[PDB]
Amino acid sequence: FSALEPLVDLPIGINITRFQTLLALHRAAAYYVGY
Amino acid sequence: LLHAPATVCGPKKSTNLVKNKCVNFNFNGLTGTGVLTESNKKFLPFQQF
Protein backbone atom coordinates (compact mmCIF):
# COMPACT_ATOMS: atom_id res chain seq x y z
CA PHE A 1 0.00 0.00 0.00
CA SER A 2 1.08 3.54 -0.82
CA ALA A 3 0.98 6.68 1.32
CA LEU A 4 1.77 9.88 -0.58
CA GLU A 5 2.28 13.24 1.13
CA PRO A 6 2.11 16.85 -0.14
CA LEU A 7 5.48 18.31 -1.09
CA VAL A 8 4.88 21.91 -2.24
CA ASP A 9 2.41 24.01 -4.24
CA LEU A 10 3.29 27.01 -6.41
CA PRO A 11 0.44 29.19 -7.75
CA ILE A 12 1.45 30.39 -11.21
CA GLY A 13 -1.94 30.23 -12.92
CA ILE A 14 -0.80 29.32 -16.43
CA ASN A 15 -2.55 27.19 -19.03
CA ILE A 16 -1.02 23.70 -19.18
CA THR A 17 -1.72 21.49 -22.19
CA ARG A 18 1.27 19.27 -23.01
CA PHE A 19 3.49 17.22 -20.70
CA GLN A 20 6.86 15.54 -21.10
CA THR A 21 9.81 14.28 -19.07
CA LEU A 22 13.51 15.16 -19.07
CA LEU A 23 16.22 12.48 -19.06
CA ALA A 24 20.03 12.41 -19.17
CA LEU A 25 22.57 11.22 -21.73
CA HIS A 26 26.16 10.00 -21.60
CA ARG A 27 29.16 9.76 -23.91
CA ALA A 28 18.12 0.76 -18.61
CA ALA A 29 15.09 2.07 -16.72
CA ALA A 30 11.30 2.01 -16.77
CA TYR A 31 8.59 4.53 -15.92
CA TYR A 32 4.81 4.72 -16.17
CA VAL A 33 2.03 7.25 -16.65
CA GLY A 34 -1.33 7.29 -14.90
CA TYR A 35 -4.38 9.36 -15.75
CA LEU B 1 -4.38 43.11 -9.90
CA LEU B 2 -4.73 40.12 -12.23
CA HIS B 3 -6.47 36.76 -12.35
CA ALA B 4 -3.24 35.20 -11.06
CA PRO B 5 -3.13 34.29 -7.35
CA ALA B 6 -1.64 36.86 -5.01
CA THR B 7 2.06 36.33 -4.28
CA VAL B 8 2.86 39.48 -2.25
CA CYS B 9 0.73 41.02 0.48
CA GLY B 10 0.84 42.90 3.76
CA PRO B 11 2.05 41.67 7.12
CA LYS B 12 0.11 40.15 10.01
CA LYS B 13 0.25 40.68 13.76
CA SER B 14 0.65 37.94 16.36
CA THR B 15 -0.85 37.81 19.85
CA ASN B 16 0.58 36.38 23.05
CA LEU B 17 0.00 32.90 24.43
CA VAL B 18 -3.10 32.14 26.50
CA LYS B 19 -4.83 29.05 27.88
CA ASN B 20 -7.64 27.90 30.16
CA LYS B 21 -9.92 30.86 29.34
CA CYS B 22 -12.97 30.38 27.15
CA VAL B 23 -12.02 33.05 24.61
CA ASN B 24 -12.47 33.58 20.90
CA PHE B 25 -9.59 32.68 18.59
CA ASN B 26 -8.44 32.82 14.97
CA PHE B 27 -5.94 30.29 13.57
CA ASN B 28 -5.44 30.57 9.79
CA GLY B 29 -9.06 31.58 9.28
CA LEU B 30 -10.49 29.25 11.95
CA THR B 31 -12.51 31.44 14.31
CA GLY B 32 -14.35 29.84 17.20
CA THR B 33 -14.79 29.63 20.95
CA GLY B 34 -13.17 27.16 23.30
CA VAL B 35 -10.48 26.41 25.85
CA LEU B 36 -7.05 26.28 24.21
CA THR B 37 -5.67 23.53 26.42
CA GLU B 38 -2.60 21.45 25.68
CA SER B 39 -2.72 18.04 24.01
CA ASN B 40 -0.78 14.78 23.89
CA LYS B 41 -1.76 13.14 20.60
CA LYS B 42 0.72 13.82 17.81
CA PHE B 43 -0.09 14.99 14.29
CA LEU B 44 1.66 14.47 10.98
CA PRO B 45 4.67 16.70 10.21
CA PHE B 46 2.43 18.77 7.91
CA GLN B 47 -1.08 18.80 9.44
CA GLN B 48 -2.48 22.01 10.93
CA PHE B 49 -6.07 20.92 11.67
Side-chain angles (χ1 to χ4, degrees):
Chain A
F1 211 91
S2 304
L4 281 77
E5 59 88 21
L7 170 61
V8 67
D9 179 12
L10 277 296
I12 57 176
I14 65 170
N15 292 337
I16 298 309
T17 307
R18 296 190 289 179
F19 168 76
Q20 206 179 13
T21 175
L22 309 174
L23 275 298
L25 280 72
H26 304 291
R27 278 86 186 86
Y31 57 99
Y32 291 175
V33 63
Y35 287 102
Chain B
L1 292 91
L2 309 178
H3 187 274
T7 186
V8 55
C9 195
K12 189 69 60 61
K13 298 175 296 300
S14 179
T15 61
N16 54 4
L17 190 68
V18 68
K19 298 182 188 20
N20 313 113
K21 293 313 151 290
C22 199
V23 296
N24 194 346
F25 56 75
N26 186 9
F27 289 164
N28 295 9
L30 275 69
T31 67
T33 307
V35 175
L36 266 293
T37 183
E38 290 182 349
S39 197
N40 52 0
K41 60 186 180 69
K42 296 186 290 297
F43 283 162
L44 275 296
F46 61 96
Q47 277 166 344
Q48 282 71 240
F49 284 53

